[PDB]
Amino acid sequence: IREILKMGDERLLRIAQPVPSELLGSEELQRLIDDMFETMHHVGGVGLAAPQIGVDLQLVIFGFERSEPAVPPTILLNPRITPLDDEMEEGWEGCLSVPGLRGAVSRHRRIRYQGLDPQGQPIDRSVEGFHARVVQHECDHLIGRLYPSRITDFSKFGFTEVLFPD
Template identity: 35%
Template structure:
């Protein structure tokens, strides 16, 4: 495993839609391992392929490790669907926008389907912080960053704060 550099906004790769993972190869497994190591070292709770320059529909997450035992997940080709009509507002940070937090409104509960590293189909219902995390990471796979989810005035203020 090795640490990978995390791209920072406004790197144009963060605005690109990623390609599906067509085959689970040794390279994909190595990418997943590197992404988990990078996420934990950052320290973050989620990291998407494009954040490390891998333009594939892959993300890793572990919403538990800062408060309990590690529970890493590798998510390939996720499909996220709102589950119910309730929304939640949460402060979201992003490893590609260091030092920036923004209040983002998202569905409070989501149903997600994905493929794991063994090629098995998975699905789960996510609520609370985990729901926000999977939506945030899935956004990265569609070229969407936190700044794209907030009002224009707040975005302008935060852009000024995070420009290199």
């Protein structure tokens, strides 16, 4: 469990450093991953960027699956996103660095993403809808973008208890 930096901290604005080839498969890289999962499981989030705990590395984790749009548990390093078409889809987002709030954000509906897993094996997936949304959201942290900077319709930005009574 680690401190989630909250919006306004200048560490969330960094352009993150690539993970060095040298740490691929290293113990230090494992501790970080473990902390990130423990921290994300504890505050009940769907995803987490290393910069959100003030670690300046292109490293994100995400994964959603319970009684019900599932997303596989993934550890993506040094990622790179390619939109597959011009189609956009609005949907609800929150974030642990912006507690108390939700916003509607329009994202690419279909992406390819590529990167490395923690042992340096390449990742290369084509995804749509929610899975595509989460990856776009987490990769924004690595270029110092939080989701309010992405909102086009501020009629749908507000406090969670006000937008969602239940």
